[PDB]
């Protein structure tokens, strides 16, 4: 304690200063984990020193910690630590900026594509990027040990300016490196735009109505006194792109997107239920505005109804916690809640209540022109040859879902890859016997996916969505139209 | 570098003289009678007196045998010479004779040898120097162990010497810092390569690395089962590059006295700081830094925090590398993983069959083996062994050879010492005994190794092999095409078919073809990890699969989950869903950067949870049919290797007859045939046995025992017990599911 | 720790010494059992002394524990205690040898059947047999307390050589004596012969083939390629002779037998 007292006293007499306390949780953990007696004395001494800052001087104390729940709650009253600032994991643009900063000194040959490296490093933090740059530089130095004379004393100057770091070194450094974030929730603005979705214009209008106007011109809502809808529930056939609409609207509104899938929900059934849901809602509120997304909302009842009857209690745990922390929420911190499900009959009726998720939007199976739109969407990043009629393929595939069309699109490219590699292997079989006998100059065959690839992909295919499911949804829609 | 100098024979026989050439002599600015420092191999120093010689070449240095032994070099080696003008006159030295030089002398060494040699000699000496003294009739060898000042001193008339003490041994046990180069490690090629790659530069050339301005590594973790030879790796690296290996033991640091433990650790770090590029080895790290919640007292927390502070206090300073050894990666306090502290993790695994053969070949060097040792099978029948077990095995084999020989009433006059090992050898029976009386220590550890089953072992199934080599071989060998064209490779394949058709054979075959590690998670373990431990086990198995890339993770009997779920209990359903959900969550967290391939196999596909069958997860479904015609012939030939196949007969008709038979039935038939043959052989042997007892001296000549007559009749009697493993209706269900798949 | 260090340094000088750490589990128990700090210091002192034992004058350390899962797991690394030898409860014959060792001086009467007592008593260890013999001797000597009872000079050997301990005293001592082993898994050679059973002529052949041959002629099995069978499953009407078959084959093959019940 003498060291702590001396530290604050010394900072007192040396002008406006900043005191930084690193690893706060290592000295002030929760009182339940405080086992000895010395730590209680240390924490109390720290609290008294903090509360003794009445006037004194212009001293600002900053502290760093990992788990905001790991700190003693006594260090949250007013006068003590009160302001909360969160430093999140950088996104793709942040990673590119970090890489640009850390590579200022080195000389890079005109073949490196920092954008690709940024896109290929999800799950890293700043320190890992710095280590990656360091390892790439060391590899580049080691590869060229001949030029630099190791000899017995200091290096020369032109030799260092002669070294260049190439893309191969970056890839090699990437291969031998493990990230550190991985199992962390990602909060990032998605990159999908409107043009990526085929059809669904009325649903786009409705979503734009229910998200944009209350935030675009809140003054009119204040003047007229409307309470905007808190939640919207999507329901329809599986694999028609509900997540795509969620991501697209999040991008267009330019807000954070937090996704919770069914696996996480079912894992947080058993045991840790209250803490996880509370933390998720707290994180959502902190990074407002955001479009919180719940996927596979029906997994509760899907697993509850069986031959077990033991997962129902934790299922009620999750649903009850969601309701409790959703109804008692402030919409001033804009948090738009969206849920998606493909089994709407079994969903608990308590959710479909005013104040909770109320609006219901039906997502139909893309039909006619929507097929052309989606095939245009999926053939924006693939060198398809200009000899295939997308119109006939669209008009042949009545009763098909988006996932099926994406599978059909990728199957033909698989055929193209196998054909190209077979041709290259055959070629290597030929010209390894005749040494460099090519009067005509031919490069690697240009991507030339022709009609037969798509014809063969079409021959062996699927019809994922069943016909009875369509009439089941239609009956449910009519029941909602009439009974309610 | 005008310091490197090849060695050469000397002209004069004086111990402390080396002959130098005049051009170098003027180049290096040396004078008559000066003293220089000689540095050789294995971190050995020497002090000498420079003498001129025109005969010696510039590149060659004339030097005698005693200095060569002291520096531990030989002819044609390279020795660096440096001027040493700061020599300090000594005041007292201690000299002792070697053990094998004073046999039957019984006299005062001060006047007979020391006085004539040391008078007006002015010969500098250093610690570790071994020199020979010529006198009346014996070449006396002396060792100097203590001097003042150390280690540089010069014999002067105003000096005091002492030679009272027991005759010291040759070099006691100081072999570690001379032995254990790279010649004394086997079955650790990749890990040793990585250590050499990431440690050579900061230890060999410090100046260049300082000039560059790049942060060196500051910590390396070596985790593995005890006895796999981690401290030996550290010792070999330090002894090879040239450093100041300084070992710190866990238990001794722990229980020194109450609160003075951290003082010793701080003193160790301070000493290592001052003494040139050095390696600090902390052994049994978990013994002093366990998990924070595990710790109960307060001194342990103080020790852990002191270690953390001293670790973070290594900013620049010098070229010090800290290496630590631990048993389990999760047993270390997670605070010792931040960047700056231990960050690089290297895994030293259990040796494989080739590694075991290499270890055995290394250890059996002093022993003079007999011409009957075929260590291949001795290595391949010892699954679940580490280095220490193999060393103990060799020691016990030697002792058992002694037991089978004995000092037969041999009065121990110490005369029978050299002919002990130089008369003996080892035979199979000794090693078989030692294997029988052995205690493996690995047992339940997941094995990562390349399986040896090739494409020839399986029979037929051309299309399935084609599809697998399509989905596995292309993306790893030609990734440029996929990257340029812009596609995502598939991540999983699910095998479904009637039981006993050879799915694991196919998985091991593709693992062998790809030359990648293999990890098998069997059904019983998967069913075990329901009741509790539904997060941890999955976590470390996926982590181990990821870190040892490439590998083909295998999940067998995936339907067992819902098979045990359905019944009269209905209580493992929460356990079932939690296990499947950790599997799914970890699977979706995979990254395409690592070449980790997931394969799941099942025989009841109609029950599997549909959430698995989604894009990104296990998507492709491949159906394994029952073998037919050429497949049956191929599998019969594959099972027909053995040692005793004799000439035998055709196999076509056997394949023609059976229809509706899987691999299990054919292997069962093969085992039945051999069982019948062995029973016949043993009853014939017993017949011979009691006919010899009926008629003594009837077979004084050693008539040949019955040959391996694996006859047609024995096969026809044995396979008569032919069993239909699979029913018929299951084929219809599988084909209906397959037709449902196609649309 | 001073006592431990003094003991080791004293034992290392006397040449071929054999230290015996009695009751090891009392000072180096399982890790989670320990709560204070002196126990950790003592355990670490023992471990570092053991590691520091380097050749020396061939000092050998033996430690005696109760069950090989109570000691700290760190005392099994190579270099420390590595060879484990168990000492099981004596069974059948062993009790006979123990009794014949203890009943050495005493003059047993000709009607004493030590074999019968050995066969009857089970669940006893050496100490129990010694106490039983002592109690029998005292029971024998009390009923004839008319010998001197007054003489300060101890009893003359004359009358004391006229004590024939009979079967009655042994039975009385056996009656009022509580055993200690009791609930312990028994490893022994069952004494049932192939004559206790009468039928099952071909099942005998099947068991013979499955059991005896692999240990008799391993060479032909390893040459021909087969891996020998590892399990056999019996099934049939309840009762009959399954357990007798298992005991008989264990007897004939001359190997230990371990039984686990439902
Ligand atoms: N415009 C589109 N309409 C429908 N599906 C699409 C479209 N574009 C892409 N998809 C496919 O739909 C999948 C995403 O569907 P998703 O929102 O997950 O629906 P579900 O939740 O029912 O699976 C993507 O894998 C993509 O291949
Ligand atoms: N190539 C090898 N690989 C593994 N172990 C070896 C090898 N060569 C020798 N050993 C054994 O390793 C032992 C030393 O390692 P050890 O001190 O047990 O490491 P640790 O203390 O980490 O278990 C030696 O006794 C030696 O018998
Ligand atoms: N190509 C093949 N066709 C049929 N049987 C085979 C083939 N290759 C091996 N076998 C035999 O079939 C058995 C396969 O067993 P295994 O694959 O473990 O069962 P499962 O098929 O249920 O995984 C092996 O014992 C092997 O001897
Ligand atoms: N030679 C014999 N053949 C058949 N049964 C016998 C023979 N001798 C004794 N038995 C009886 O057979 C019984 C075997 O039953 P037991 O061992 O209790 O259970 P299990 O049904 O497992 O054998 C014994 O109780 C024994 O009395």
Numbering used by the authors:
A (entry chain B): 283 to 766
B (entry chain D): 22 to 764
C (entry chain F): 283 to 544
Report text from the authors:
Endoplasmic reticulum–associated degradation (ERAD) maintains protein homeostasis by retrieving misfolded proteins from the endoplasmic reticulum (ER) lumen into the cytosol for degradation. Transitional ER adenosine triphosphatase (ATPase) (VCP/p97 in vertebrates and Cdc48 in yeast) was identified as the primary energy supplier for ERAD and has been shown to power the defolding of ubiquitinated proteins via its interactions with the heterodimer Ufd1-Npl4 (11–14) and the deglycosylation through its interaction with N-glycanase 1 (15, 16). In humans, Derlin-1, a homolog of yeast Der1, was found to form a tetrameric channel with a central tunnel ~10 Å wide, indicating a protein channel mechanism for retrotranslocation.
The p97 hexamer twists as D1 and D2 oscillate, and with the same moving rhythm driven by the p97 NTD moving back and forth between the up and down conformations, the Derlin-1 channel changes its shape and size of its central tunnel and the distances from protomers γ to δ and α to β. Superposition of the structures using protomer β as a reference molecule revealed major conformational changes around the N terminus, the loop between transmembrane helices TM4 and TM5 (loop L4), as well as helices TM1 and TM2. These results showed that the Derlin-1 channel switches between a tightly closed state (tightDerΔ-p97Δ, state T) and a loose state (the major conformation shown in Figs. 1 to 3, state A). The root mean square deviation (RMSD) between states T and A was calculated as about 2.56 Å, suggesting a moderate conformation change. This dynamic change could result from a coupling between the p97 ATPase activities and the channel action during the substrate recognition and retrotranslocation or a passive motion in response to substrate passage. S10, while the α and β subunits of Derlin-1 exhibited similar overall folding and arrangement of central tunnel residues, the δ and γ subunits in state T adopted a conformation closer to the center, resulting in a tighter overall structure. At the same time, the NTDs of p97C/D are relatively flexible upon ATP hydrolysis in their D1 domains and thus act as “rotors” in driving the conformational change in the Derlin-1 channel. This leads to a transformation between states A and T, whereby an intramolecular rearrangement of the transmembrane helices occurs, resulting in a twisting or squeezing movement of the central tunnel. The relatively smaller actions in the state A to T transition may serve to extract the substrate from the ER membrane. Moreover, conformational changes in the p97 NTDs, driven by its ATPase activities, further tighten the Derlin-1 channel (state T) until extensive conformational changes in p97C/D ultimately tear the channel into state U.
